[PDB]
RNA sequence: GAAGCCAGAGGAAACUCUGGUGGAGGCUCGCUGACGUGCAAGAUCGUCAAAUCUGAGCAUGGGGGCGAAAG
């Protein structure tokens, strides 16, 4: 038919244009022309066989408007390649804007462009116009509506991210991400949070004459003063590029964190707890500051946002070069095991616990409070040198949650204690051998602060109602840590 | 198978416009002052029709010299300070640099 | 707020000068009318208007 | 041990252990 | 085979926590009572009595009406005019004062009945906090300072019998003796439970018998 | 005295042995301190000198503290 007429002419251009560009130039309108029918298969075929041609045909580089023989076809040629590659954007622009319902006969042109999309920015993302494309995935990544477009233009973005080396199209994605996150005003759906994460850069005997060989010698020593002034510029562009996505990613987080959206709080701090140790000292104190007004906010749902920035806050610690940083850069977490402390009579009470790789964006409240009970008891540092009276004192509260608490979480909780006295031992077999119990005061359990509370002055004595508790795996696990306290 | 888009910026950068700024904020010189010294033998000089090379050798020969202060100079640093100017890896690999530095000063006194 | 503190280290704010208001101790920002003297001195083509 | 191996959040899943 | 049944009827209470649907798991929670009671099971039950209190009837103030108080035991919904009735505040609050009396008075011995209660007492001391800081429902506000009155009470009596008790980890013989030889009147939670199932009954009677003759003079 | 190559004998092959040929080696012969890491009460691992000899010509770098370097 006249399918198949394009069929032919289609075929023809793109062999053409393989085997000797150069001298073909106008082809790449002729293309545009041929994709101008208004039938649909021939529409689909068309915008295929452009994102093909386009692919081999673009140079490693791109080229200046001229403005103002074979330097003049070369010229011709690549200004019709532009001229044509531009053309192709605002097809594919007008596309994928276009309305995707249509009878079921296959994939929509919407889909194949948005396919085609994907694989121009995974292939040639070097070349012009690389914003109006990015700028294409975006209008498509800012909608709130789950499809296969959506994912497929996500992990699009993702494996750029984790390719760029360069950085000018990571600084565009991220420029373009930052601006529709505001403009939308933090509705997106956090995958294109998580890209934030998923960035990279945050992380024979040949004869030769006389003269050839002295030009050669030329060249030799012109590279290699080319190499090293390439490898100084490079490690500073490298550097300027990751402060200015570094500024950016940060801005949307704390923009993010200000305005309190509650369905991105768990990304946002999953980023800065990993950025962190990549933005300065200084913020690194502010950013603790921060965590804990944010903890003062909410004490003034709640619980979750709590115990996520409990774990932010920890996990920054323990990162190591925070964790060497310490002492000089005054980085105290005593407000937030304070704050642990004292709650932990509360989320006890809340029954919106069990209610739902990654290291903080965990959907479950009890997930997260263990998390903030191994940060605080079981750490990966300095793990036998934590205050006893710490120690006892957690072991307290945590028996009695685990009472008071549902019978997965209070297994974990279980599980967690009968770690601790694996890990520790000797420091609190006096909580439960009474002939040890300290007579310096007496317990006092509605403290304010851990110190406060004397934790040797007091007995477990909650077993005698979890072995009762109607769980054979929590009676099985108070079992168990009967018999490592046995074989102490 | 089937074969959101939708006035000027002034940015300062320079240190003598950061010690203009300071002259305003603190109560030194008013805008009435600003004006006045505004009417001075660099005013009233045309600008827009002129050739590159004109333009850029009287921008070379002819910058004018005001005082600056340590305050203002201060402050243009820390506005164009990098986000990662200062890591604790490099401030710790710094520390650590200069201490190697110190041990071998001592070393080759021995 | 801490988290406004860290926005505008991040991203300085316009008239940011690194100065602290005597009359009110928050930090003293120049307003869009200054920054147009600043502009209006520091290039001289316009002292003043009409 | 036991702390990591249940503080994985898929171990919460709510499964009544009746349908095993 | 208690395992799965504690299973599915925490599952059936927490399916839709509303307002309108607080009588199931009411009789829910006096199934599972009953239960605890016969077997020797522990049975959390505290999270879910203090949901019902830290529900959203219970904070605004009650609607003025006049209309017949809820019998509970036929209930399986709450009628639409029953939605911020004084009548109905009144009737749940009796009924959650009771189900925590029960379980209160059901674990009033063990030796760790001082930290089995300390969360609750707290919560419920938060509670008088918060709403005479809420409504205007002072009988409720009363049963429940006489009901964490009782709590703390039976806590200081535990704690005071507690002292002397050996349990060295592998010595356990005091505390599987604790107070094998006494019976649930002795405890003050024993003697308010028993004095509230009293008062209780004879309201019971009153209502009943009053309902009787009513029915006799429309006949 | 290693790679590489040759012949004989077993192994389906990959291989193994023997006899050799060969003559590459940060291989031999002639007359320690300084630190760093440590995640404990110090273990282990890493880095720094000791840099073909020699005639006649020639160039360069030098102190300290501050600082991420640029200065």
Redesign the pocket.
């Known amino acids: 038919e006249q399918i198949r007429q394009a069929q032919e002419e289609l075929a023809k251009i793109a062999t053409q244009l393989n085997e000797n560009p150069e001298e073909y130039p106008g082809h790449f309108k002729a293309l545009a022309r041929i994709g101008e029918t208004p039938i649909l298969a021939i529409q689909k075929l068309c915008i295929v066989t452009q994102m093909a041609v386009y692919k081999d045909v673009i140079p490693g580089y791109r080229i200046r408007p001229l403005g103002e023989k074979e330097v003049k076809r070369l010229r011709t040629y690549e200004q019709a390649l532009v001229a044509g590659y531009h053309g192709y954007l605002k097809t594919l622009a007008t596309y994928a804007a276009s309305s995707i319902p249509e009878d079921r006969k296959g994939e929509p042109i919407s889909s194949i462009a948005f396919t085609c999309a994907c694989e121009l920015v995974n292939a040639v993302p070097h070349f012009n116009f690389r914003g109006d494309l990015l700028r294409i995935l975006v209008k498509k990544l800012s909608t709130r509506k789950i499809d296969r477009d959506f994912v497929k233009c996500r992990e699009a973005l993702e494996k750029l991210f984790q390719d760029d080396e360069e950085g000018n199209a990571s600084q565009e994605a991220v420029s373009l991400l930052s601006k529709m996150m505001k403009a939308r005003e933090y509705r997106v759906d956090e995958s294109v949070l998580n890209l934030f994460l998923h960035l990279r850069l945050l992380s024979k005997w040949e004869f030769r004459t006389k003269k050839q060989r002295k030009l050669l010698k030329a060249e030799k020593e012109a590279q290699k003063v080319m190499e090293q002034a390439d490898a100084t510029v490079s490690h500073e562009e490298r550097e300027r590029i990751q402060s200015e996505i570094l500024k950016m990613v940060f801005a949307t987080y704390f923009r993010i964190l200000k305005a309190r959206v509650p369905h991105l709080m768990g990304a946002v701090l999953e980023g800065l707890a990993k950025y962190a140790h990549l933005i300065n000292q200084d913020f690194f104190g502010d950013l603790l500051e921060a965590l804990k007004d944010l903890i003062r906010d909410t004490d003034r749902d709640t619980s979750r946002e709590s115990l996520l920035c409990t774990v932010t806050a920890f996990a920054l610690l323990e990162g ?1 070069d925070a ?2 940083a310490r002492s000089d850069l005054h980085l105290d977490l005593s407000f937030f095991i304070t704050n642990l402390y004292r709650s932990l009579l509360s989320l006890s009470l809340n029954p919106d616990l069990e209610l739902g790789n990654n290291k903080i964006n965990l959907q479950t409240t009890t997930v997260l409070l263990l998390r903030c009970l191994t940060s605080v008891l079981l750490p ?6 934590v205050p006893p009276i710490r120690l006892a004192a957690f072991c307290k509260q945590l028996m009695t949650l685990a009472l008071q608490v549902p019978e997965k979480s209070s297994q974990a909780i279980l599980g967690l204690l009968q770690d601790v006295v694996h890990t520790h031992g000797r420091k609190v077999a006096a909580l439960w051998n009474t002939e040890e119990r300290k007579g310096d005061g007496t317990y006092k359990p509605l403290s304010e602060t851990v110190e406060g509370s004397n934790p040797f002055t007091t007995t477990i004595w909650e077993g005698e109602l979890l072995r009762k508790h109607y769980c054979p795996k929590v009676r099985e696990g108070l079992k168990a840590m009967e018999k490592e306290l046995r074989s102490i | 198978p089937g074969l959101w888009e939708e006035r000027p910026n002034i940015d300062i950068i320079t240190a003598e416009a950061m010690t203009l700024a300071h002259q305003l904020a603190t109560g030194e010189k008013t805008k009435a002052d600003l004006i006045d010294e505004g009417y001075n033998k660099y005013a009233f000089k045309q600008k827009e029709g002129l050739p590159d090379w004109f333009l850029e050798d009287e921008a070379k020969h002819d910058k004018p010299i005001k005082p600056i202060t340590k305050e203002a100079a201060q402050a243009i ?1 820390e506005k164009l ?2 986000l990662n ?2 890591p604790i890896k ?2 710790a690999e ?14 080759k006194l ?1 | 707020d801490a988290l406004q503190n860290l926005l505008d280290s991040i991203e300085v704010p316009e008239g940011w000068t690194g100065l602290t208001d005597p009359n009110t101790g928050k930090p003293l920002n120049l307003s869009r009318d200054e920054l147009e003297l600043i502009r209006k001195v520091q290039q001289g083509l316009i002292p003043d208007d009409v | 041990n036991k702390a990591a191996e249940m503080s994985v959040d898929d171990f919460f899943k709510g499964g009544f252990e009746i349908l095993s | 085979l208690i395992y799965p049944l504690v299973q599915v009827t925490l599952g059936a209470m927490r399916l839709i926590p509303t307002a309108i649907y607080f009588p199931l798991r009411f009789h829910l929670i006096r199934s599972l009572l009953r239960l605890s009671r016969a077997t020797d099971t522990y049975i959390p039950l505290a999270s879910a009595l203090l949901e019902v209190l830290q529900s959203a009837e219970m904070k605004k103030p009650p609607k003025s009406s006049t209309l017949k108080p809820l019998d509970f035991a036929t209930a399986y919904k709450t009628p639409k005019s029953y939605l911020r009735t004084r009548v109905y505040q009144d009737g749940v609050g009796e009924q959650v004062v009771e189900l925590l009396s029960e379980f209160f008075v059901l674990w009033s011995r063990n030796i760790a009945f001082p930290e089995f209660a300390l969360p609750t007492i707290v919560a419920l001391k938060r509670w008088m906090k918060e709403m005479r800081k809420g409504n205007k429902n002072a009988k409720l506000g009363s049963s429940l300072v006489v009901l964490v009155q009782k709590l703390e009470m039976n806590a200081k009596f535990i704690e005071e019998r507690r002292a002397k008790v050996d349990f060295a980890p592998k010595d356990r013989a005091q505390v599987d003796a604790f107070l094998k030889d006494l019976e649930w009147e002795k405890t003050p939670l024993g003697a308010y439970v028993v004095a509230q199932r009293k008062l209780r009954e004879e309201r019971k009677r009153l209502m009943e018998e009053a309902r009787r003759e009513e029915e006799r003079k429309r006949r």
């Open positions: 190591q964790h060497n990966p540092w300095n793990i036998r040198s | 640093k300070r990098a100017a200062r490099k401030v710094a520390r650590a640099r200069r201490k190697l530095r110190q041990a071998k000063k001592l070393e021995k």
